[PDB]
Design a protein around this ligand. Structure first.
Ligand code: PNN
Ligand code: PNN
Ligand code: CAC
Lengths: 137, 137
C-alpha cells in the first residue's frame, strides 16, 4: 500500500542496473553517460522543443539544456526549432533497442499477450496521471 | 517490435516516475542540503546498508562519482560509516515516504486492489527475472 511504492522503487533500481550492465560496452564506444544516453532514448520516442524536454526531464532546466547542447556537439542530435536525433543518434538507438528487446522478449516469452496487455493498461493510466500531476505545480 | 513497444513505454514510464519524484522532493532535498543523486544513494541505503563497491556497480557508474556523493553524505550526517543511515538520514527517508505515499495514494484510490495486485504480481516476476539475469551479468 506503501510497500507498493517501495517495490516500484526496487523494480526501477533493478531495471536501471540491468540496463547499465547490458549497455556498458555500447555507451563506452560512443563515450556517452547514461545521463546523456537517456535523453536520446527520450527523443527516440518523439521530437521535442528544447523547452518541452525540460518539462519531461524534470531536473534543472539548465542541466538538461547542457546535455542537449552536449549531444549537439557530438552531432548525435540535430535541429528542427525542434530537437531530433541525428542519423548517428538513430544508429545508437537501434543498437540500444536491439539489445533491450532481445533480453526483454526472453524474459516474457512464457507470458500470454493478454496478460501483458492488461498490466500495460493499468500502467498507462498511471503514466497518464503522473504526467498530469507533473504538468500542474 | 510488439515487445519493443513495451520497452519504450516502460522506458517512458520510468522516466516519468523519476521526473515526478524529483519535482516532488526538490524542497526536502534542499532543506537537508542534498542533491537528487545523493538522495538516491540514501533511498538505496534505506533498502539496506551497502558498501561503496555495491552502490557503484548497482547504479552502474564511474569511479570517483559514488565515493564523492558518499563523502558528502557522511559530512552532512545522514550516513554512518560498510555505510549506514543515521537518525537524521532515517528522518529524511521517512519524510520522503510520506510525500510519495500521499501522492501515490491519491493517484490510485479509485483502483481495484485486485487490479493493483495482479499488476504487482506480474512485475514481481519480472523483477525476480531481472535480478536473476543481472547475476549472470
Ligand atoms: C546547471 C547544471 C545542472 S548544468 C551545469 C554544468 N553541467 C555539466 O555537465 C558540467 C560539464 C560541462 C562540460 C563538460 C562536462 C561537464 C554543471 O556542472 N552544472 C549544473 C549546475 O552547475 O547547476
Ligand atoms: C539511474 C538513476 C538512479 S539516476 C536518475 C535520477 N537519480 C536520482 O537520484 C533521483 C532520485 C531522487 C529521489 C529518490 C531517488 C532518486 C533518477 O530518478 N534516476 C535514475 C535514472 O533513471 O537514471
Ligand atoms: C544531417 As544527419 C546527422 O540527420 O544525416
Amino acid at each position: 500500500i506503501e510497500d507498493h511504492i517501495s517495490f516500484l522503487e526496487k523494480f526501477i533500481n533493478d531495471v536501471n542496473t540491468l540496463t547499465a550492465k547490458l549497455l556498458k560496452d555500447l555507451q563506452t564506444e560512443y563515450g556517452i553517460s547514461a545521463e546523456q544516453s537517456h535523453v536520446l532514448n527520450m527523443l527516440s520516442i518523439e521530437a521535442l522543443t528544447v523547452g518541452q524536454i525540460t518539462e519531461k526531464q524534470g531536473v534543472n532546466k539548465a542541466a538538461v539544456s547542457r546535455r542537449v547542447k552536449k549531444l549537439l556537439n557530438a552531432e548525435l542530435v540535430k535541429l528542427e526549432k525542434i530537437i531530433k536525433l541525428s542519423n548517428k543518434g538513430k544508429k545508437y538507438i537501434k543498437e540500444r533497442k536491439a539489445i533491450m528487446s532481445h533480453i526483454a522478449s526472453d524474459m516474457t516469452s512464457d507470458f500470454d499477450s493478454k496478460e501483458i496487455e492488461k498490466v500495460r493498461q493499468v500502467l498507462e493510466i498511471i503514466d497518464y496521471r503522473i504526467q498530469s500531476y507533473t504538468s500542474k505545480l
